Design a protein around this nucleic acid. Structure first.
Ligand SMILES: [Zn+2]
Ligand SMILES: [Zn+2]
Ligand SMILES: [Zn+2]
Length: 84
DNA sequence: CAATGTATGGCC
DNA sequence: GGCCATACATTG
């Protein structure tokens, strides 16, 4: 079972374990070509670029409202939830 | 592995 | 309320 001994935390697979340990280094090699903000992992930088592009790719199919991140949309769906 | 999905919470 | 970073997951 993959486990970070600093946090005492388990991971299901190796990939997130390696990413977690690299975040533990403190290094931020992935930088934005626009605002020069640096990031631990490329995943985070990819999500960052949407703030510059303005694309709200994630749309509620109930009320047509649009969102920057899928997580925001998922949160929003709790508002339509509560009606059977 | 990358892509995609979920979850959290400070900040405006 | 949602933007946004951060951090975990499963899927292909
Ligand atoms: Zn750790
Ligand atoms: Zn930037
Ligand atoms: Zn909606």
């Amino acid at each position: 079972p993959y486990e970070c001994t600093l946090c005492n935390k388990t991971f299901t697979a190796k990939q997130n374990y390696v990413k977690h340990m690299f975040v533990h280094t403190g290094e931020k090699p992935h930088q934005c070509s626009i605002c020069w903000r640096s990031f631990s992992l490329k995943d985070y930088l990819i999500k960052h670029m949407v703030t510059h592009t303005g694309v709200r790719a994630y749309q509620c199919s109930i009320c047509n409202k649009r969102f920057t991140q899928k997580s925001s949309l998922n949160v929003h769906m709790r508002l339509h939830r509560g009606e059977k």
